[PDB]
Every structure is written in structure tokens, then in C-alpha cells.
Amino acid sequence: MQDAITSVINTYDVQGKYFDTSAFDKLKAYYATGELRVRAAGTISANAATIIKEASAKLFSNQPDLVRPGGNAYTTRRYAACVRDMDYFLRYATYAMLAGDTSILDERVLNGLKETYNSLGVPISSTVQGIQAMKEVTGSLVGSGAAKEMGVYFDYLSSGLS
């Protein structure tokens, strides 16, 4: 994976250049947002189970068909699989927020996810809606400061599926 610091390092290494003023500016920006990212990650670690609870409850309230007979989330096995996917999404969005980079999202989540969901018949729109529900719950818990940052990675994941 790649984070903001390693991204700057790679950019300047490809050019064979020592760090100039712009590079130090970007590094200062990441170091300045670091404590906010760490607080958000700690809060999400503390409340991940609650986040998945409330996000799944909201998604299944808006789309009751998903957990009723005939829905893709109707069985104990498929309900557990849905919750496991949402747990994936939350944990990896937390990783991407703590890194300040969406590379880990591409290289551990989105690669082949659309093909997997299309092979299984998993509805992409409802998965995107569940990611929005996670976005709302997580943004409410982390606070206004980190909500905007966390929504960036949730939106990245949603746009990757949709």
C-alpha cells in the first residue's frame, strides 16, 4: 500500500529529486492532519460494532426487501455475508483515512469486487446504499472535523462499486 508520505517520496524518487518546498508543504499538511486522523481511527475502533449495527439497520429499514424472503440478504448465511462485507468496508475505509490515501482501497477492496458481486447476483446499488449508511453513522460518531475526511474514502469506495 501507499500513504501520503510514501506518495510524496515516490513522486520525488521518480524524479530523482531531493525534497523541495512543495514536498515539505505536503508533508506538513499530513503531519498536521495526523492527530485528527488518529482520533477518528480510535473512535471507529471503539465503535465499529455499533457502526455496523446501525448502518445495517438503516439499510435494511430503507430496503426491507433485502432481508425478507427473496432478498439477497435473506438467510442467516447471506445476512452474515452482508455484515461481513460492511465490516470489510468500514475497516478498510478506516485504514485509508489513517493513511490519507485511497491506494489500499483499490488494491484490497475494489479489485474484482464488481465481478464478485455480479457473479453472485449481489445488488450493487444496495451495497452502495449500505456504504452511504456507514458513511452517515461514521461521520456522526467521528465529528464534523473528521467526517469530511472519512466521507472521502467512503465516497471513493461507493464510486468504485457504482
Partner: protein
């Protein structure tokens, strides 16, 4: 199904079904009409079984519908009874199938994670399925009560 289990076991060994498995299939196919009678009898008493089982469960575990419980309130109790109705339908499916497979892929795989996400207490689920056992086996003859209690016990052990 029994036929499915026999075929799957034979396929794991890359062989045709032995005369023992064919005899087992003949026995199940001969017991099919009695199984269908039992399934019809349980299906017709759907509402009575669910109502009585809910009553016994809530009297045995008053805290479930007590404040601070997972089933507190009218709508959560209705969801509780809906869950019981699901499992009764699954038990009838298992009766006609001659084994607990459909019960397993519909209601037992991942039920632990599901009810954890729902903060539903698994023990209370166990007393619920035992109350269902009592009520449902009460309306059947002893012989049929035996096989039906077998599926209810599989469900109770799977949830526990």
C-alpha cells in the same frame, strides 16, 4: 435432502451409490407420505404453535419482554414471533427433506453473527425453540413427535 446427502457422499468418494445408500433412499421415499402428513399437520397449526410457543417463552423468560430486553415492546415481540414462524417453516422443510440440511443453509449458517449484529440473545432463542418443540410435539402422535422433536433438537443445539 437425504438423496442429496447420499449423492454428495458418493461423489466425495468418486463412486456410484452403494446398495446401502439405495436402500436408504428407498426407505426415505417410502416414509415420504408420513413426512408429508406431519408437515401438513404442523403447517395447519402455524398460528397456534407460534402463539403458544411465544407465550411459554415469555413466561419462562420474562426479562426478554421486560424493559432493557431485546424483545421489549410490541414491534420487537412481533419480530420475535416472525423469527419463530421462520423457524417453524424451516422445520417443516426439514421434515419433508428427511434431514436438517435446508434448516442448516437457511437458518443455521451465520445465525450467530446475525443475532450478534441484532443483539438478540442466543439462549433466549434456545428456550424459544424448546417451547416450539413442546407445542408442536403436543399436537402430534408419539411416533411423529419423535422425528419432529429430532429436528427441533437439532435447531436447539445449533443455536446453542
Amino acid at each position: 435432502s437425504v438423496v442429496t446427502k447420499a449423492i454428495v457422499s458418493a461423489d466425495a468418494e468418486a463412486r456410484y451409490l452403494s446398495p446401502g445408500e439405495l436402500d436408504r433412499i428407498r426407505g426415505f421415499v417410502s416414509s415420504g407420505e408420513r413426512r408429508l402428513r406431519v408437515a401438513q399437520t404442523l403447517t395447519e397449526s402455524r398460528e397456534r404453535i407460534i402463539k403458544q410457543a411465544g407465550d411459554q417463552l415469555f413466561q419462562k423468560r420474562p426479562d426478554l419482554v421486560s424493559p432493557g430486553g431485546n424483545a421489549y415492546g410490541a414491534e420487537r415481540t412481533a419480530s420475535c414471533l416472525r423469527d419463530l414462524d421462520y423457524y417453524l417453516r424451516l422445520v417443516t422443510f426439514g421434515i419433508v427433506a428427511g434431514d436438517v440440511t435446508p434448516i442448516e443453509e437457511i437458518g443455521v449458517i451465520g445465525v450467530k453473527e446475525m443475532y450478534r449484529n441484532l443483539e438478540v440473545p442466543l439462549p433466549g432463542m434456545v428456550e424459544a425453540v424448546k417451547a416450539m418443540k413442546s407445542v408442536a410435539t403436543g399436537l402430534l402422535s408419539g411416533d411423529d413427535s419423535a422425528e419432529v422433536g429430532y429436528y427441533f433438537d437439532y435447531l436447539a443445539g445449533a443455536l446453542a
